[PDB]
Nucleic acid binder design. Sequence first.
RNA 1: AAGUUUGAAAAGCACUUUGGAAAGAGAGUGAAAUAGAACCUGAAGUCGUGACAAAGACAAUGGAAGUACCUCCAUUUCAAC
RNA 2: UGAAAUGAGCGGAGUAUUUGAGCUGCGCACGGCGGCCGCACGCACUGGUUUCUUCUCCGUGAUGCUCCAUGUUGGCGAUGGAAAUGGGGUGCCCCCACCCGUCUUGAAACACGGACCAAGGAGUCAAACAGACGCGCAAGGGAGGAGAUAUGGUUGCCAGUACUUCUCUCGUACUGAAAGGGAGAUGCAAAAUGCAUCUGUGGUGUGCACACGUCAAAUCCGUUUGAUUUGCCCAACACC
RNA 3: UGCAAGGCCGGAAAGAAAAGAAUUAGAGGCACCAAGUGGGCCUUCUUCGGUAAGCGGAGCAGGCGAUGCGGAAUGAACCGC
RNA 4: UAAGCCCAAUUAGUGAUUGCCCAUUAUUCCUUUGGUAAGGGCGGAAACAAAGGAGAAAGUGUAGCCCUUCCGAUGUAGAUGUGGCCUGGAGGUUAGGACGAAGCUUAUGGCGUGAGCCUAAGAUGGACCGGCCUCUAGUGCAGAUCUUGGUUGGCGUA
Lengths: 229, 145, 144, 96, 68, 126, 197, 49
Amino acid sequence: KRAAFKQQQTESFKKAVVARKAAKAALKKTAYLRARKYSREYRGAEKKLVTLRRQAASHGNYYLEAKPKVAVVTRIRGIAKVNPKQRKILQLLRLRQIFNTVFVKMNKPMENMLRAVEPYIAYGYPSLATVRAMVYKRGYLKINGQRVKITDNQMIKDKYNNVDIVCAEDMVNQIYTCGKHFRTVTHGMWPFKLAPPAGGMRQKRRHFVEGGDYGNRDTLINRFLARMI
Amino acid sequence: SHSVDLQWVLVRQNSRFLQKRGGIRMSNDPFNNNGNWTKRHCGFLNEKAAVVKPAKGGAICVTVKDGSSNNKPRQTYKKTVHAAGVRASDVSRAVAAVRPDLADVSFRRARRMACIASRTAKVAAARKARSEKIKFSRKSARAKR
Amino acid sequence: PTRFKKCRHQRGSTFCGYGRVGKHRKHESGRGNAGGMHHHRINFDKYHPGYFGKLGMDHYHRKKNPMWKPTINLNNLSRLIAAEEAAKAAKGGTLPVVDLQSSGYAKLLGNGHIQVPCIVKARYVSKLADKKIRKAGGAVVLQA
Amino acid sequence: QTKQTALVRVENVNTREDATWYVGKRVCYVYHGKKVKRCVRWSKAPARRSTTRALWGRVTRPHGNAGMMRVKFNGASVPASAIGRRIRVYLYPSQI
Amino acid sequence: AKSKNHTNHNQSSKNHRNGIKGPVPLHLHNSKRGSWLPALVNARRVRKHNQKAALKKRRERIAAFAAK
Amino acid sequence: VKPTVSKAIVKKRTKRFTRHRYELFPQLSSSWRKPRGEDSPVRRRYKGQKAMPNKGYGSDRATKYITPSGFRNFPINNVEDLYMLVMQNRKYAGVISHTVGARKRKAIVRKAMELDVRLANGNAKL
Amino acid sequence: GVDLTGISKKSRVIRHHTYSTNPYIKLLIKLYKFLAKRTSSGFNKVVYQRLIKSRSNRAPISLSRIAVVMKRKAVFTAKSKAAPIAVVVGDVLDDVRMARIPAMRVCALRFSKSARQSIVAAGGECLTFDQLAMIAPTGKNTYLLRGRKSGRESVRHFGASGVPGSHSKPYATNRGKETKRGRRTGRSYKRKAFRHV
Amino acid sequence: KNRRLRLRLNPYVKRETAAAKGMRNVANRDARRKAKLARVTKAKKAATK
RNA sequence: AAGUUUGAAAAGCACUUUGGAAAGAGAGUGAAAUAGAACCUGAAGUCGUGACAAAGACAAUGGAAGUACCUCCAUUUCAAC
RNA sequence: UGAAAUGAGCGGAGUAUUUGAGCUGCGCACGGCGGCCGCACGCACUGGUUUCUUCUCCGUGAUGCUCCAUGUUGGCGAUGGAAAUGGGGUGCCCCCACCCGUCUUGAAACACGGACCAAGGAGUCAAACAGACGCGCAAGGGAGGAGAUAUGGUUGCCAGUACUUCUCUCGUACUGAAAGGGAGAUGCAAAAUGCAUCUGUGGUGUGCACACGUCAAAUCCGUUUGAUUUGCCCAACACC
RNA sequence: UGCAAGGCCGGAAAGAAAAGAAUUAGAGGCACCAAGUGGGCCUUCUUCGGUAAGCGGAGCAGGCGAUGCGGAAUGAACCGC
RNA sequence: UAAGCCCAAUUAGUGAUUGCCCAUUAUUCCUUUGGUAAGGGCGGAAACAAAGGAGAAAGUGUAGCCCUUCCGAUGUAGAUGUGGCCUGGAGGUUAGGACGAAGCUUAUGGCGUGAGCCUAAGAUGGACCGGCCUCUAGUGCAGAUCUUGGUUGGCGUA
Ligand SMILES: [K+]
Ligand SMILES: [K+]
Ligand SMILES: [Mg+2]
Ligand SMILES: [Mg+2]
Ligand SMILES: [Mg+2]
Ligand SMILES: [Mg+2]
Ligand SMILES: [Mg+2]
Ligand SMILES: [Mg+2]
Ligand SMILES: [Mg+2]
Ligand SMILES: [Mg+2]
Ligand SMILES: [Mg+2]
Ligand SMILES: [Mg+2]
Ligand SMILES: [Mg+2]
Ligand SMILES: [Mg+2]
Ligand SMILES: [Mg+2]
Ligand SMILES: [Mg+2]
Ligand SMILES: [Mg+2]
Ligand SMILES: [Mg+2]
Ligand SMILES: [Mg+2]
Ligand SMILES: [Mg+2]
Ligand SMILES: [Mg+2]
Ligand SMILES: [Mg+2]
Ligand SMILES: [Mg+2]
Ligand SMILES: [Mg+2]
Ligand SMILES: [Mg+2]
Ligand SMILES: [Mg+2]
Ligand SMILES: [Mg+2]
Ligand SMILES: [Mg+2]
Ligand SMILES: [Mg+2]
Ligand SMILES: [Mg+2]
Ligand SMILES: [Mg+2]
Ligand SMILES: [Mg+2]
Ligand SMILES: [Mg+2]
Ligand SMILES: [Mg+2]
Ligand SMILES: [Mg+2]
Ligand SMILES: [Mg+2]
Ligand SMILES: [Mg+2]
Ligand code: NA
Ligand code: NA
């Protein structure tokens, strides 16, 4: 019949199965609640901005928008004929391959880093849909040094070990709002590897202002990425 | 004295029972139930072993080494013969009484022996039927002593 | 064995690891120790300083036998004392007698701490060795 | 050239929308050999025995803007001796 | 014949291939050899006192641990 | 005996890697030799030239070494060698060595038919 | 097409098998590979890694060094606690300079005859690594030791002896040769004994 | 685009698509447009007074 | 330079026929005669012949993918399959 | 082709859950005028209304360590000088495609060697040294040359194997040109060879494991896996 | 009791706040033994001699050499990769 | 009424923001190979004759223990590795051969990424010889105005 150590393993595995199902249910409920809260926060923030703009326009004033805090950066040139400073900057940006895409904080250090590699990278200000699409379709985590596709919230919770980041919507919120754990989330992910933009580019050798591709194109980066994603 | 691990390290690369033909490492060890050249199947090497053998009459013989007489080569292996029609599970239990890690292969080998006996009988019958119509100019008969 | 050399690995390489440009020529730098002061100066200077020049007096007919003077330290005297001799040895009692010249030593040196006290017969001794061996309850006996 | 894909120009198909309508349709190239070889219904329909052979393919996607189509034949590619020759584009499989 | 005289063309690339190594830190290889002699002698005397003090403290710690 | 069914056998390349320009000189064997010429267009990988073997052409390990019958070849020299393949008769087939004579081959073939052991070159019958 | 420049500089030379042909070393490697994989303790991992190493990197250790470090551990060790097992993954060699040693339990790959005799005579025990695995599978209450390699003549010969600050021995069969030009100030210069770094 | 994976990552995606369907509703959209225009125009006209 | 290394044994091709002869065609010895004499095996290269594949002039060769035709080859199937 | 279907998708059960959009309460926030007047409908009450919109809950471990084995409808296959598939040949079509080896910044070169084939043809052996790795012993290691005797035997195996050196050599100690001198620790101390003891890292900084706890995370609740405090610190590095 | 230097004992430690307030496909150090190479050429930009040169000579950096592939009809180096 | 030049666009003041073609590039799928590789299983769970099967090795490296999962793959000179291939001998160990051994021939197939290995057929041969572990070397040819031998177009030509 069944050996003693086999029976002990059977009991332990039964307990493990029960615990795993309970943990899956709890994580699902927590993720649902967090996603609801983030959705309501986003909608409220947009409505608040709309009302502020309307109040400004009503009395002849202007509304200055908040300077964007996050930029999404993609490499649009190959790896040939790169000067050492640009090569080092692109290595620090984890943009080692063409159409590699990352999120960075739009502050003075990073802004001056991006100014020196502008001919190589097209960048701009991501929308919520862009962040969600990249995380859901192109999102990969660094797990034991391996590039592992995000398929469940349990792996996210195991990767980050942070109460603030237990699901994909926590990652989307941290990236989009530049939260306390922005660097943790973005560094925990593998650099995004995108397809070429379906429909073609304009000109990789010219700035977007000149009719090319390589500049800061503000929120127009979203159409470019939507074709790339 | 000298453990099975040490002997296996000594003989894994070079041995008379290892048959490296092509790139396949088989084993013509008579106490190997499988023909694979592994430490588990080397019946000539392990302290205890059990190998399923054919017997005359379609019977199955189980050869067992116990490790009690491993220093007496003519007393090392004791043969037990199972009458024809024996369940392969009974042979599997006879083997597993000495080595539980050879139960599945011993069951498969006992069933294989039964199939081999039945097919050998059929092929012999067919050959005898074919031979009844040949002239056979020469026939050799061994003398009796 | 010939089957382990780089020659076997280089069959079909056409150059055997000497290059297409420099090639393998007979003596591209001279023979032996040539040029130690010209075109091999850096190698000699950084790897064999002191190689050139003269130093010291000459000794025309040098004989090693008169100069024979091997030495042993105090903390190595157990190598000459046997096991039961070492076990039965203490200050004020019967001590093993060590004959240095029969054991192949001429001078007794004083490095370390003597473990088992003993009477040492030596041709030579340092002052520190003599002082220490007397302080430990042993002695040194001069011999020729 | 890459011979695993072939380009077929069909009469009265001069727009990418028409070629899209033809995506997935079966495609046949009919020729003849020198001998009479095996065929479908060789035994059932001995009247089909002939030197005539056929290579079958399907329309994979439109090509360009002017009604050209990309065709891939089953396994082997279509021979270059068919360049400039007739191609049969049937109306099946039917989506309408 | 005439050849090229001098260039530094590939030399920075070669220097950075194994990188320009950072300096040995200040706490390593801080030898005082060649420094101002009176200060070195005074510091040597202080260090000898400190070695005596360290031996004394170790003996006291062993004694305290044994007594406990 | 029937061989064990495996995944469909896929060969990355059927043509052999033959030595460069061996058809022009009768003394050159077709056996592959790595071109080490400085200007060699095969070594430099020009588009219209023949290819060089590399690790990417290696066969799928699941179906590697499997003959078209589905079995794997094991050289066999006498009757006693048949019993090594008895338990694995659906995986290995016996290949009688070329230098085994017709007499011992008759013995081997008879025993292999009795044992239901496939022979790759055991002629005729079944 | 990924810009991986110097990625091969990151790779280090890691060996997972032994060059040793000794079958008993193979058995120990098997045992401690299993132990390091299946037990959480870092002692087993270090022991397996050292068993993989080469002969030059498993340097011998004297018996006197073991006695000194074990005494240094014995003070500040509670008298109730038993003394640790000294574990060396090389050879243990006797030391004629230390006649009196305590009763120590020493585990080593090999003992010299004199070292084994000394340990047994002092009241201690020479342990074998499989005995250690049976009596301490995790490595609890052990003293893992290494031999000294800084005093080997190969190390004393490493580096150029002609650069300033260098005190390496030259490769010279004759000692009286190579003593004049770069060695004495009177022979036009002397290699400086010290150099700030 | 995969329902299994999208729902696994975001359990709240059912409510979001329900709200999207509500917004796409023609009667709902037209009523909302009329109400929004009236409401915003009234608010602006009151604000400028 | 050159192994006289035919064959177990000369049993070293009697005899007939054409040919001036050399030889040929038969016959015979031999287990073998493309074992016939400085003769065991008899390679490559080159050449002859019969059959077949065709093929302008793209020097030829070569790669990749098909197809026509052939295949003394390798497998698998032939029936509730 | 269900040999594990994880499914908003396959089952079971409920007519509901709660998303959003409308309308709207209180306070705050925001705007204007400088406390009021406005609030486009922002935040908290996870506010109210359900007028429109919407699927809502549960659910199966592996007692499968691994690999391989499962539909439908026709055609072709009924032992055939068969069918089929895969290999080989030869020709053709479309496309692709400069002559090899070499020196050279640069070769298809109007740079050199290149009619064919067979056989042959080029990092070897010895000695000194050193480094890596494998062995054996280790404060010791090892010969060598010779001896004896199994063998004072045997055609030959056997020119091998077996055995022994108060020796020799390398090392355990360096240094000076030489004369010739020659290295432990601690304590008390301050003697131009000080004295006492001998279970001992000369000291400091950084430093595996181990021991002691203390934290955080994940836990099948047994633990593991990352710190990190203290002690000892091995090996190593640095300063004395 | 001040200063200087070695220590010892305690304290406090956003482990480095907020102000755009870094980032990293960030294992840091330490050796040992050796090979080829030591004729270079081209290019953006800067530059010297020369009327100039597909000339001679330098600086920063990319290439070719050592490298094909896709483009500029063709071209070591141009564009893309 | 460009198929030229300078500007613009993407099916056109219609109702929104991807015309189309081509890479050894990008994304993705399959397979190979190597990691500074990352993990799981390995105490045979129980049962099971013939007239669901087989395997399961504590392992650098093989036909790799087995499975899962990531990442990288070009390269002269040059280095290194390879239970990587091949040749003549030596210790071993297993075989084979007059019912045909080595040599030789091939539209003669199979296996291997390859060096190569194996089978088949000789209407070839007529006596030796294969596999595996280890030891050993006069151990691999396409070219050196290479050596020797033979052949050869020029040529039935001068
Ligand atoms: K020939
Ligand atoms: K063809
Ligand atoms: Mg373009
Ligand atoms: Mg450019
Ligand atoms: Mg069982
Ligand atoms: Mg060559
Ligand atoms: Mg070399
Ligand atoms: Mg040179
Ligand atoms: Mg003088
Ligand atoms: Mg120069
Ligand atoms: Mg092949
Ligand atoms: Mg070149
Ligand atoms: Mg043959
Ligand atoms: Mg030393
Ligand atoms: Mg001759
Ligand atoms: Mg006859
Ligand atoms: Mg013949
Ligand atoms: Mg002949
Ligand atoms: Mg449902
Ligand atoms: Mg040359
Ligand atoms: Mg030139
Ligand atoms: Mg050339
Ligand atoms: Mg020219
Ligand atoms: Mg020349
Ligand atoms: Mg001797
Ligand atoms: Mg010394
Ligand atoms: Mg800050
Ligand atoms: Mg040169
Ligand atoms: Mg020039
Ligand atoms: Mg060059
Ligand atoms: Mg062009
Ligand atoms: Mg090379
Ligand atoms: Mg030879
Ligand atoms: Mg041919
Ligand atoms: Mg040779
Ligand atoms: Mg040759
Ligand atoms: Mg001629
Ligand atoms: Na012919
Ligand atoms: Na000696």
